[PDB]
């Protein structure tokens, strides 16, 4: 009743509190009370139905609804505390029944708790994913109603969690493409002024539109037109913090926009985009997002291309990108550049003649100019004249070392060195002129970094000019100011050593100059950081052990130098929150193709290490000393280890020093990556064998004792930023602790790490999962079984995407010879496989980002190799072929290659039957283009070759084939042989099962060779030696002499 509702709210709060305090009342009793509460909510629905006929206190009815909502808040606290499968299902179904569309209005007083608990409680997947896909559709309908109800103020608070759950551990919303479009339209209808869901819902929309872009690009075009409206919408408003996500979404369109550049999404869209780019600069008036000049681009390097737009299409190479992973400051400022790049992206390919001079060309515009010389230059195809005109302004800027010069130097030198073409001999000394600015840096450490880093080498790096600097390369260094860490590390010395190693090219005293440089390396502002500004080659960086081992390679000895196995071991770690935002979508994109001296140095180093000043520098120099000790053993230092132990004892407070120590352990692994001290030895990790064994590891014993200190799922994101990387390194250290100790102890340790906590390190934990404490099979088998028993101890945790995916990935670590064990491993493997070939995946309800990995594991499941999948892997493959996903589409593209040398005759025929399908829709979505790719692979597959030819005949409607031209020779390097499609079997024998039988539209675009070939073959076509029927009625179409045919 009306008053009974408030009485129930008070009684529920009091009873829940009293039961929780006493703990005598059973959680089963609490679940029964929750069932009674759901019954009371159903009674509330019945009372509303009764009030429909005759009015009984309608305002008091809403008041009773609010009171029952308070009672439901108490009961929801109880349910979040304790959840039973029938009870959780009852609560969820009551929540679902709460939404009444028939009424046309809802109090929504209890609406706050629902989605918040859904995202917060019962996360482990039996309870959560117990709500099936139909429940997700119902949630979509509820969100659609909320869109009309919100701004229902609490509908926004619920929609926050709704957007959090929209792209889930498995989200089939994009699978519901009509529902996907409807929900996208609903989301676009409320361009929210302020919403925590705005960024996550827009990100889910961006991922879905990215999926829609290659396959069914028509829905992608509808979404893109909506985004075109949203672009001017963003051009209207101004709020920088939300503008971060707004620009993120605009950039999500931006790869698709660059796609649409070739064939205009709108021919006039460029001018509108230019206006919106002016609005983008206006929004970027926030000086926080600023110029890329001195972005400080930590860890930039040459010989590996850049990823600023993060699209492989550019082929632009190695721009020194702001690290943005420092703990990632510049990315949002880099966001400003994208806005600039956006206007730079804007042809209004059309601005160059005017964009040459008019622009103020500020540093904020200068970074955009660098982006121009990369990408707009890629899209430019500028002739010699345009480059001749453009280079003049940058050259003049370089002439005067004014404020215009410094921000220019990097981009200008990059444009000079890297371009569409090369240059003439006239600019020869001009490189030294370029070198002058770098010479300027060689003493001026501040502006130095790029100059001393890039284009200080390129003349050496590209042997495209006269060796005039053969005397002049050391000339700037001749200032006795060569020793400079001001730039990207080790570049100058290493490149110079290589260059002078040409042919008597080092026949000069410059080896002594290198010796002086190394001596400076020994004491370069000894025991402390020299400078405070921008920290290049900093102690702040992890290490460059290659420099430590370098000197011998720098030394010229007869065939003695050089090594292998650099082993970065996740050094860049570009992953970052606020960088991980676009990264997981940016992880995958598969658009359809279109358009004794060293002994002396070490001896002095001992005395140098006898004194130290700084602590972070202590870590850096400890790494240097340990690497030299590995380097010395290569030439052949427990004292450096003792010094590092002292430095560690100094950092007694935090564990991030132990994180630096884990970096040093990764350094040992990189020394271990080197075969041994002598090198080129069959022994692996022998170079770090002393580091690992207690001998020469007395200080490492102390570090291991430090490691012995006790101190949704943690693998939250498939595309995971750092910290999850920190979790991976932490698990590595966990392994390292027991490794130094010399499992049941490892079992108790992984028990100390919570299942949710230990869920983070997929590859890291999987490595130990493959590892066995002893060679005895039973112990490792029992440990793996205990791991499965812990994952399924809460069957929901096993049901969770994180734990099951961890098991799936660890299976690949278990994918090996495994000769010793032959007992029950397959049984537990199948017990896992029941939901490893996920029951969701079996129902095609698996993860989208997880879908490609699932196919990769299914291929990694190799029935043909040794042991077949007892359950038909062919059946799963056929279901997946019926199944549809863009990641699964690229997986299907790869599966044709995977089929080769892996098709057992029965399995081959089973796949061939699925390989046979005449599909119309997937061609525009390129799914049937993937089928045509499989058909070309079948042309590469002699097995069922006649079937391959039949599938060639039936596979192509020729829709998009003419423009494709064997994917412009990508599918077939020489199409013309099969462009005139008369295959060996096809040309020699008329294609047949053994009204025109040949489909002209599937055959070719024009009459071309098709009609004449058919006319020529008509004689064999009529009598096709499989039946006498083909002769009949052939003469009616032939309109030729019958007597001649009979002859």
The DSSP code sequence of 402-461 is SHHHHHHHHHHHHHHHSSSS---STTHHHHHHHHHHHHHHHH-TTTHHHHHHSSSSHHHH
Cα–Cα distance for residue pair 126/1047, rounded to 1 Å: 76
Tell me which residue has tokens 């079948």: 938
862, 869, 750: which is closest to 812 by C-alpha?
862
Q: Are 341 and 250 in contact (CB under 8 A)?
A: no
Torsion angle of C-alpha atoms 337, 343, 347, 349, degrees rounded to 10: -20
Distance of CA 678 to the CA centre of its chain: 39
Q: What is the CA radius of gyration of the chain?
A: 34
Distances (CA, A) of 562 to 547, 612, 632: 12, 31, 15
Question: How many CB atoms lie under 10 A from the CB of residue 837?
Answer: 23
Cα–Cα distance for residue pair 405/398, rounded to 1 Å: 5
Cα–Cα distance for residue pair 701/215, rounded to 1 Å: 57
Distance of CA 408 to the CA centre of its chain: 32
Q: Are 152 and 108 in contact (CB under 8 A)?
A: yes
Cα–Cα distance for residue pair 570/666, rounded to 1 Å: 9
Experimental method: cryo-EM
Torsion angle of C-alpha atoms 217, 222, 228, 234, degrees rounded to 10: -110
606, 625, 596: which is closest to 691 by C-alpha?
625
Tell me which residue has tokens 């096709």: 1024
Residues 6+ apart with CB under 8 A from 354: none
Q: Contacts for 304-309 with beta carbons within 8 Å, 24 or more apart?
A: 306/374, 308/334, 308/337, 308/371, 308/374, 309/254, 309/255, 309/258, 309/341, 309/375
Cα–Cα distance for residue pair 451/413, rounded to 1 Å: 8
Distance of CA 290 to the CA centre of its chain: 26
228, 290, 235: which is closest to 254 by C-alpha?
228
H/E segment holding residue 51: helix 27-53
Residue 292 tokens read as 């890329």
H/E segment holding residue 745: helix 744-752
Buried b (16+ CB within 10 A) or exposed e, 411-424: bbbbbbbbbeeebe
Cα–Cα distance for residue pair 463/455, rounded to 1 Å: 13
Torsion angle of C-alpha atoms 579, 582, 585, 587, degrees rounded to 10: -40
3-state secondary structure of 1027: strand
The DSSP code sequence of 913-966 is HHH----STTTTTTHHHHHHHHHHHHHT--TTHHHHHHHHHHH---TTHHHHHH
H/E segment holding residue 673: helix 656-673
Cα–Cα distance for residue pair 221/254, rounded to 1 Å: 14
H/E segment holding residue 756: helix 755-758
- Helices 638-650 and 698-707 sit at what angle, rounded to 10 degrees? 30
3-state secondary structure of 1025: strand
Cα–Cα distance for residue pair 942/949, rounded to 1 Å: 10
Distances (CA, A) of 153 to 158, 183, 191, 239, 430: 9, 19, 16, 22, 66
Phi, psi for 1027 (deg, rounded to 5): -165, 160
Distances (CA, A) of 638 to 549, 626, 642, 660, 677: 18, 9, 6, 19, 16
Cα–Cα distance for residue pair 1010/1013, rounded to 1 Å: 5
Residues 6+ apart with CB under 8 A from 388: none
Cα–Cα distance for residue pair 339/359, rounded to 1 Å: 15
Phi, psi for 458 (deg, rounded to 5): -50, -40
Cα–Cα distance for residue pair 469/478, rounded to 1 Å: 13
Cα–Cα distance for residue pair 536/454, rounded to 1 Å: 13
Cα–Cα distance for residue pair 559/106, rounded to 1 Å: 83
H/E segment holding residue 73: helix 58-81
Residue 1025 tokens read as 């030696």
Q: Are 501 and 556 in contact (CB under 8 A)?
A: yes
Q: Are 259 and 591 in contact (CB under 8 A)?
A: yes
Question: How many CB atoms lie under 10 A from the CB of residue 946?
Answer: 13
Q: Are 25 and 31 in contact (CB under 8 A)?
A: no
Question: How many CB atoms lie under 10 A from the CB of residue 43?
Answer: 12
Q: Are 31 and 82 in contact (CB under 8 A)?
A: yes
Residue 786 tokens read as 């205990």
Cα–Cα distance for residue pair 430/426, rounded to 1 Å: 8
The DSSP code sequence of 597-663 is HHHHHHHHHHHHHTS---SHHHHHHHHHHHHHHHHHHHH--HHHHHHHHHHHHHT-S-SHHHHHHHH
282, 188, 181: which is closest to 230 by C-alpha?
188
Torsion angle of C-alpha atoms 411, 413, 414, 418, degrees rounded to 10: 150
Q: Are 700 and 736 in contact (CB under 8 A)?
A: no
Residue 559 tokens read as 């065939």
Tell me which residue has tokens 């440089």: 517
Q: Are 316 and 375 in contact (CB under 8 A)?
A: yes
Question: How many CB atoms lie under 10 A from the CB of residue 371?
Answer: 26
Cα–Cα distance for residue pair 356/132, rounded to 1 Å: 58
Q: Are 760 and 715 in contact (CB under 8 A)?
A: yes
Torsion angle of C-alpha atoms 437, 443, 445, 446, degrees rounded to 10: -60
CA atoms within 13 A on the CB side of 946: 8
Residue 75 tokens read as 């009961």
1, 145, 127: which is closest to 61 by C-alpha?
1
Residue 428 tokens read as 């020869």
The helix, strand and coil proportions of the chain, stated in percent and rounded to the nearest 5, come to 60, 0, 40
Residues 6+ apart with CB under 8 A from 911: 874, 877, 878, 899, 903
Distances (CA, A) of 734 to 340, 647, 668: 46, 22, 16
Residue 360 tokens read as 């103020």
Residue 796 tokens read as 């929901």
Phi, psi for 1025 (deg, rounded to 5): -70, 60
Cα–Cα distance for residue pair 322/331, rounded to 1 Å: 7
Residue 653 tokens read as 């407070």
First to last CA, the chain: 99
Q: Are 592 and 695 in contact (CB under 8 A)?
A: no
Q: Are 207 and 168 in contact (CB under 8 A)?
A: no
Cα–Cα distance for residue pair 949/248, rounded to 1 Å: 47
Cα–Cα distance for residue pair 1002/995, rounded to 1 Å: 15
Q: Are 310 and 254 in contact (CB under 8 A)?
A: no
Cα–Cα distance for residue pair 317/305, rounded to 1 Å: 4
Give the sign of the dihedral formed by CA 53, CA 57, CA 58, CA 62.
negative
Tell me which residue has tokens 């199944």: 883
Q: Are 444 and 462 in contact (CB under 8 A)?
A: no
Cα–Cα distance for residue pair 486/463, rounded to 1 Å: 25
822, 815, 837: which is closest to 883 by C-alpha?
837
Residues 6+ apart with CB under 8 A from 482: 442, 474, 476, 492, 513, 517
Phi, psi for 902 (deg, rounded to 5): -140, 25
For 1003, counting Cβ atoms within 10 Å of its Cβ (0-12 exposed, 13-18 middle, 19+ buried), the class is: buried
Q: Are 504 and 556 in contact (CB under 8 A)?
A: no
DSSP state of 374: I
Cα–Cα distance for residue pair 218/277, rounded to 1 Å: 26
Task: Report the residue count for the chain.
Answer: 1047
Cα–Cα distance for residue pair 428/435, rounded to 1 Å: 11
Q: Are 586 and 339 in contact (CB under 8 A)?
A: no
Torsion angle of C-alpha atoms 478, 484, 486, 491, degrees rounded to 10: 80
Q: Are 325 and 574 in contact (CB under 8 A)?
A: yes
For 435, counting Cβ atoms within 10 Å of its Cβ (0-12 exposed, 13-18 middle, 19+ buried), the class is: buried
Phi, psi for 138 (deg, rounded to 5): -65, -40
Residue 554 tokens read as 């720098």
454, 250, 446, 451: which is closest to 336 by C-alpha?
250
Cα–Cα distance for residue pair 884/215, rounded to 1 Å: 10
Q: Are 578 and 331 in contact (CB under 8 A)?
A: yes
Which residues sit opposite 1025 in a β-bridge? 1027
Cα–Cα distance for residue pair 748/736, rounded to 1 Å: 16
Residue 160 tokens read as 């926050």
Which residues sit opposite 1027 in a β-bridge? 1025
Phi, psi for 384 (deg, rounded to 5): -65, -35
Mark the breaks in the chain: residue after which each occurs, C to N over 2.5 Å. Answer: 151, 325, 348, 595, 636, 711, 742, 994
Question: Apex CA 620: angle with CA 617 and CA 623, to 5°?
Answer: 150
Cα–Cα distance for residue pair 869/834, rounded to 1 Å: 12
Question: DSSP alpha helices (H): ranges in 837-926?
Answer: 839-842, 849-860, 873-882, 886-899, 905-915
For 718, counting Cβ atoms within 10 Å of its Cβ (0-12 exposed, 13-18 middle, 19+ buried), the class is: middle
Tell me which residue has tokens 């051009």: 235
Residue 38 tokens read as 């759901």
Cα–Cα distance for residue pair 517/515, rounded to 1 Å: 5
The DSSP code sequence of 797-838 is HHHSHHHHHHHHHHHHHT-S---S--SSHHHHHHHHHHHHS-
Residue 256 tokens read as 């698709």
147, 158, 338: which is closest to 244 by C-alpha?
338
Torsion angle of C-alpha atoms 63, 67, 69, 75, degrees rounded to 10: -170
């Amino acid at each position: 009743k009306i008053k009974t509702r408030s009485d129930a709210l008070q009684n529920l709060r009091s009873y829940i509190i009293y039961s929780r305090n006493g703990n005598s009342l059973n959680q089963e009793d609490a679940l029964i009370i929750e069932k009674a509460i759901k019954r009371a909510f159903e009674l509330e629905w019945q009372i509303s139905a009764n009030h429909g006929k005759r009015q009984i206190s309608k305002a008091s009815q809403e008041q009773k609804l609010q009171d029952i909502s308070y009672l439901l808040r108490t009961c929801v606290e109880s349910y979040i505390l304790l959840f039973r499968e029938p009870h959780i299902l009852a609560l969820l179904d009551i929540i679902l029944r709460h939404t009444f569309t028939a009424n046309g209005s809802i109090c929504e007083v209890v609406c706050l708790n629902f989605s918040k608990a859904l995202r917060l409680l019962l996360s482990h997947s039996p309870h959560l994913h117990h709500l099936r896909f139909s429940d997700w559709q119902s949630l979509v309908s509820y969100c659609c109603q909320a869109i009309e109800k919100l701004s229902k103020q609490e509908v926004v608070e619920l929609i926050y969690v709704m957007r959090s759950l929209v792209q889930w551990y498995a989200a089939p919303i994009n699978f519901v493409s009509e529902q996907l479009l409807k929900f996208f339209e609903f989301f676009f209808y409320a361009y929210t002024e302020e919403t925590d869901a705005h960024l996550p819902a827009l990100q889910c929309l961006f991922q879905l539109c990215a999926y829609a872009i290659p396959n069914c690009n028509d829905y992608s075009a509808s979404v893109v037109l909506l985004v075109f409206k949203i672009l001017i919408n963003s051009d209207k408003w101004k709020r920088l913090d939300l503008r971060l996500q707004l620009i993120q979404c605009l950039a999500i369109s931006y790869p698709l926009w660059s796609n649409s550049e070739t064939w205009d999404p709108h021919r006039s869209i460029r001018s509108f985009n230019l206006d919106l780019l002016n609005s983008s600069f206006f929004s970027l008036k926030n000086f926080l997002n600023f110029f890329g000049k001195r972005s400080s681009l930590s860890l930039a390097n040459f010989r590996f291309h850049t990823v600023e737009p993060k699209n492989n299409i550019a082929k632009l190479y190695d721009p020194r990108l702001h690290l943005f992973f420092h703990n990632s400051f510049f990315e949002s400022y880099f966001i400003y550049f994208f806005l600039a790049k956006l206007i730079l992206l804007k042809k209004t390919s059309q601005i160059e003649e005017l964009l040459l001079q008019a622009e103020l060309a500020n540093i904020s515009a200068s970074s955009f100019s660098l982006q121009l010389m990369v990408i707009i230059t890629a899209i430019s195809d500028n002739l010699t004249n345009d480059d001749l005109l453009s280079i003049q302004k940058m050259s003049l800027n370089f002439t005067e070392k004014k404020n215009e010069l410094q921000s220019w130097s990097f981009f200008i030198l990059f444009n000079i060195c890297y371009n569409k073409a090369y240059s003439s001999m006239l600019t020869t000394s001009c490189k030294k002129e370029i070198l002058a600015a770098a010479s300027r840096g060689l003493l001026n450490s501040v502006t130095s970094p790029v100059c001393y880093q890039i284009l200080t080498y390129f003349n050496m790096y590209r042997p495209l000019c006269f060796a005039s600097i053969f005397p002049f390369i050391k000339q700037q260094f001749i200032l006795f100011n060569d020793y400079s860490p001001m730039l990207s590390y080790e570049a100058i010395d290493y490149w110079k050593s290589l260059y002078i190693l040409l042919n008597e090219n080092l026949f000069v005293g410059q080896s002594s100059f290198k010796s002086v440089f190394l001596k400076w390396l020994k004491w370069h502002l000894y025991h402390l950081f020299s400078k405070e500004g921008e920290l290049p080659f900093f102690s702040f960086t992890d290490s460059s052990i290659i420099i430590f081992d370098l000197l011998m390679m720098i030394f010229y000895r007869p065939l003695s130098l050089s090594y292998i196995t650099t082993e970065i071991r996740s050094p860049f770690e570009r992953n970052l929150f606020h960088l991980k935002e676009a990264w997981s979508p940016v992880t995958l994109r598969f658009p359809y193709t279109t358009d004794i001296d060293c002994d002396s140095l070490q001896n002095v180093i001992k005395m140098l290490e006898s004194s130290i000043d700084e602590i972070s520098s202590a870590s850096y120099d400890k790494d240097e000393l340990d690497k030299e000790t590995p380097s010395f053993e290569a030439v052949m230092n427990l004292f450096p280890e003792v010094l590092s132990f002292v430095k560690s004892n100094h950092s007694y407070d935090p564990i991030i020093n132990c994180i630096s120590t884990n970096l040093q352990f990764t350094i040992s692994d990189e020394p271990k990556h080197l075969r041994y001290e002598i090198g080129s030895d069959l022994i692996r990790s022998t170079h770090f064998r002393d580091s690992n064994p207690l001998k020469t590891l007395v200080l490492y014993i102390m570090d291991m004792a430090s490691k012995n200190v006790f101190i949704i799922r943690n693998h939250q994101i498939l595309g995971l930023m750092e910290g999850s990387l920190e979790q991976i390194r932490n698990t590595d250290l966990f392994i390292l602790q027991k490794y130094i100790d010399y499992h049941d102890s490892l079992i108790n340790i992984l028990h100390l790490y919570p299942i949710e906590t230990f869920c983070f390190g997929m590859s890291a934990i999987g490595a130990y999962f493959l590892d066995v404490a002893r060679t005895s099979e039973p112990i490792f088998y029992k440990c793996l079984e205990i791991l499965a028993q812990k994952i399924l101890m809460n069957y929901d945790y096993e049901r969770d995407e994180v734990y099951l995916m961890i098991f799936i990935k660890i299976f690949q670590k278990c994918v090996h010879s495994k000769l010793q064990f032959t007992d029950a491993t397959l049984k537990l493997i199948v017990k896992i496989t029941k939901f490893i070939e996920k029951v969701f995946i079996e129902t095609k309800f698996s993860s989208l980002s997880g879908r490609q990995t699932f196919l990769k594991f299914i291929f990694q499941l190799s029935p043909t190799s040794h042991v077949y999948s007892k359950f038909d892997y062919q059946k799963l493959i056929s279901l997946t072929l019926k199944d549809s996903d863009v990641c699964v589409i690229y997986n299907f593209v790869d599966d044709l290659v995977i089929f080769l040398k892996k098709c057992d005759k029965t399995l081959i025929e089973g796949f061939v039957l699925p390989i046979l399908s005449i599909k119309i829709e997937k061609s525009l979505y390129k799914g049937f283009c993937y089928l045509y790719l499989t058909l070309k692979v079948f042309l590469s597959i002699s097995s069922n070759r006649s079937a391959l030819l039949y599938q060639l005949l039936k596979l192509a409607n020729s829709y998009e084939t003419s423009t494709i031209f064997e994917p412009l020779l990508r599918k077939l390097h020489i199409q013309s042989a099969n462009i005139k499609q008369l295959f060996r079997i096809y040309r020699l024998e008329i294609f047949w099962s053994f009204f025109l039988e040949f489909p002209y539209k599937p055959i070719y675009f024009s009459l071309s060779d098709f009609l004449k070939e058919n006319s020529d073959e008509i004689i064999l076509v009529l009598i096709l030696t499989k039946n006498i029927t083909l002769a009949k009625l052939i003469t009616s179409r032939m309109s030729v002499d019958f007597s001649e045919k009979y002859t």
